[PDB]
Design a protein around this nucleic acid. Sequence first.
DNA 1: TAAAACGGCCAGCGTGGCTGC
DNA 2: GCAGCCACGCTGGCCGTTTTA
Lengths: 152, 589, 261, 289
Amino acid sequence: SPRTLTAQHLNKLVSVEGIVTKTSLVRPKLIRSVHYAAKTGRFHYRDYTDATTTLTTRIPTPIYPTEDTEGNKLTTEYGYSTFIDHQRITVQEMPEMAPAGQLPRSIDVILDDDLVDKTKPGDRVNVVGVFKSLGAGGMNQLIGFKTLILGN
Amino acid sequence: LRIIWGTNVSIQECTTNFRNFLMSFKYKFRKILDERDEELYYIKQLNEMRELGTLNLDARNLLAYKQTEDLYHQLLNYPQEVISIMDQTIKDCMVSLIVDNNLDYDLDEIETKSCKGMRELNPNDIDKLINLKGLVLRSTPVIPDMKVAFFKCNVCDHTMAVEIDRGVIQEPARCERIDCNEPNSMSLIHNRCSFADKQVIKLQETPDFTPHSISLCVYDELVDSCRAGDRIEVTGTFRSIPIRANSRQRVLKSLYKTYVDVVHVKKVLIDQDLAKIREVAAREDLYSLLARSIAPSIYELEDVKKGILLQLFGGTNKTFTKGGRYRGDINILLCGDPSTSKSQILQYVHKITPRGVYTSGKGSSAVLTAYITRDVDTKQLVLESGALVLSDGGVCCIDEFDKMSDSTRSVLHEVMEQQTISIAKAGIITTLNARSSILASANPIGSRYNPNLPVTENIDLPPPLLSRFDLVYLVLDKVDEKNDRELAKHLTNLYLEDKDDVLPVEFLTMYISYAKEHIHPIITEAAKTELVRAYVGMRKMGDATTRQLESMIRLAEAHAKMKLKNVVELEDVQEAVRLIRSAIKDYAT
Amino acid sequence: VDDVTGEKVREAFEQFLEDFSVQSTDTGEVEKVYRAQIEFMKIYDLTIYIDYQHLSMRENGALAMAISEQYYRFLPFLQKGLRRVVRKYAVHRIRDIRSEKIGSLLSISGTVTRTSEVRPELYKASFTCDMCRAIVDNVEQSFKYTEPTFCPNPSCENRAFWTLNVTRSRFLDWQKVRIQENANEIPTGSMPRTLDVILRGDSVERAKPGDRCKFTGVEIVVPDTQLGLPGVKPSSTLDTSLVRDLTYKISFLACHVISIG
Amino acid sequence: FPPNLTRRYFLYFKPLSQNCARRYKPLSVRQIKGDFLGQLITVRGIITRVSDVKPAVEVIAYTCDQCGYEVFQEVNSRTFTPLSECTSEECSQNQTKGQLFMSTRASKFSAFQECKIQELSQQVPVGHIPRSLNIHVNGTLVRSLSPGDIVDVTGIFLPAPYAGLLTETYLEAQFVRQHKKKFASTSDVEERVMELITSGDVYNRLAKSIAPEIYGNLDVKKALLLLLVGGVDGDGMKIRGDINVCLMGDPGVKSQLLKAICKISGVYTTGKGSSGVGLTVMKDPVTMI
DNA sequence: TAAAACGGCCAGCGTGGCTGC
DNA sequence: GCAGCCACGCTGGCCGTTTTA
């Protein structure tokens, strides 16, 4: 349940039930870059990760590369460069399950590539995934540590 | 040969070839036209530039002339310098003509002086000549522009200056004790420097043969060289300039912003007729010729047409020594049964009025006046004048007068009585006058006006305002056959072919304007005898007030303004009273 | 250069006001009308009330056609001459505005709209560094909020700076109204035009929204949505890393404003 | 000078037909996965909110003005940055460098315009909302796509570079095949018109032919034919060749003929579906309207 | 994380004081 | 007594530091 979900029933795999509502927009994301050098006549390789994909706290490696080592033009290529779609949705619990009288409260779960656009706003869905918490919780520069759910 | 690095032209071939064009024109366009006074244009036009002490040109003088054809495409491809060279050699031609007398207009100071639209226009046309048309949307205020800068310093304050470049203004480090030994800081005054004038005006076209709007960037001499709403053809050259990113840094975004830098405007703040006016004025049948020639669509309401004629010749604006201030305003409403094309009559009146305003019913409020609204670009609240302010001087037109609101038609009391407008809220507390000739029409309750019934009853008007009006008309339906035959033959001829009387279209239009200031009808003693003489018989009907007396005295002098009469006459008063009495005899029922 | 031209104009006008003002005889005022104006001012302790015709009387417009072109050039000369007199004794419209009209004199009538509040001014920056002698007083007052001067002559440098003294100065109050154009001169189909006007000093609060007034002939331009206007926008790259750019507009300033109408 | 600086031409690719593929593509926007970037696709849809064509800067010339050389800056990105005062070969190794500025006539441009494509609304799922997609148009094919049509669009799918790793996509057009061929662009006309005239009883067949899907209302079809005719027109007024016949009565006549009028002749509007700005002001898109 | 602006650090030039002819 | 060399002061250029989008 989302009502007793915080602090404990945390950093584990959680089975959540509820309603599909307010489906967000579909945007694709780049992962593996392919770059061709003119003079060497060779290809290259460069990847990038974010906190949605790794599931492990790794050093983020963000700028699109050109002119790496000798002065060879790093012409990027496509087709062979990979992509994966991305989406986030909100699921509030079922309203009859609620306490004496209150407005139900909710969280969100992020999907991945082959599961984009499977829930429309307004259905009944059981969800199995992993509770993932990202972001620098106010130690950046006042209440942080915003949440979501992955591995779905 | 002289030559510029970036271009392919010369000084002397252009100068001598332009002089060749300026010394040779013999109606060559008529030679191509085959003709279906042969002196060249530029001699006479250079004389009009010369003796008057007063650049752009059209296209056909350079096409028909065989020479300077290369000069046509050079100007077409390099308009920036060729015009300056043309003005230089025109100045030299002025000096070549001035050596005849050598003292002419103070030689030193006069010496010192559409195929397709915008959407079809390709971006290929970077610096070209484009012939376009359309309308004008609005006009921004004046934008200043620095041409010569101004600089000062701190130690004894030397104030040398430098001019603006094409893009920036430079300034040295040290000026006092010249640019050496860094004595002090240079001062800069951006108000002692020279300037220029530039204004941006956005235009909308009428795509003859999605909507689009264009803009332009006129300069010093073209300030207010265009009005808003005119059908102006636009001659200009295309431009394109980069824009910043987020209006802050120098990272220029792609897709440069383009504009127009116009050349010539099609805008167009190639007495003697008075004797003909007096000829027609000496005509005995003027009272029928002038009124009959007004509206050839209806062959009736001759009294109404006469009243409409007198609406522009209305009264003598008589102000007393203390108080008084009695205008010559008259307001007449006509109403009645349909199938009269009354609306076409009123629109025709709107056409006769030089500043006509044609309004209607249920689209007005008190707030035709008080057009206060919010600004867009300055983001403020600007108070605006209403429709009746557009009627200031002339005749207003209102439709469906019976169908006004509570606020609408109630404001009219101030106009009919004080002829003022009272503005008094938190923004501006200030009254102003706006005089006009209010004329309207409405429809009664019953579809057919029945007899044996009051006129005040069968019209949805307030009775204090009803008698406040000058004259009220009645349009009734007739069961005849003769009027229906002349009606249908007349209207069949007006409908057929889609369109023995003298019909002056504009003689009367200028006659009224001439008669407005030059005619002051006087109402002396002899008329008062007849006035009281008619007034006792008028007062005899009762169970007639001073309202009717003011009506007759303002209508008699109205007819006296007609036919150029500065005095009153004992005659013209009989039909003046009878015009009111025709309505009164219609009030028997 | 301008000091000499303005000094000659200044001395001739000082002699002018020191000469007769009004030609009228003993029946009425005789002479020294502006001198009686200053004595009238001594009675009330306010300003100056000057006529365009009286300034146009002595030099037959030679001095009038000296001032009516660059008045902005001749403000301190006109104040210094009047100051030495003190120590010695004790119509157009908005469409008629061009760039040649800067510094010159032109009278404009109109429609008052959107009065504004009262706000004080400054023109007395007393700002000096952390050094002991922190008692300077910048003689700058221009349309810039640059309080601390660079070169003082203490041990402090130009980077040593502190705040401006808001306690040892002379201020003035003023409002800023935006006049509207008359509706009796606009043509048909035309919306009204707007123009800003600045009311400076003693003649404050005389405005009233919805009034016809006559104005002082002077005019100014204030330094600055006018981005990507387009137009060649100047920058301040002086002659020798990388200042701002600018695009201005015509404004208005006045010292004598009558409110007749 | 680089040869890219002096081109004057363009190159267009060419798609393969399905007949030879049969011997030796119908995609939906939902079928456009965001993983086919760099591939070759073929889409179909409805042109919606076509923007206007505006010039695209390609290369930047830079006049030396001191040594007389020409520096060139080629830009293939959206933005770029200003360069130094001069990059001449002679301005260098000297105390007084030049001062450059760009030029218009020496730079090279290209036609640029984009629009949006709405889904077919027939391939939309039963509980989804249709999406749309941006397609860039360049060069010769510009000013050739009217909004609200049915067209076969072919192209290549490329992303655009700009929370940190969000890729916004688009499509570059390659070929246009428009369904519903536009009229007015006489032989084939009179091939059927002369046969229609010689068919006999033409006047009853014409009005009988407009919307024959109802029973009765013969004079009503006569009025519909006359409304379809219209077409009529010195120092006075012209004549308006428009007909305005109102309809009163109920109920089985009721929208069956009303939508049919715009079918034979058309935007269908209702009472509340159009506001005060609907039947007669918005922020201007990419290209105060 | 990149770009722009200002201050600090590093390099080059000139004047005054000290030493030699 | 004057000219040349060394030491101290002043000026110019490059690298480092800080903030917004």
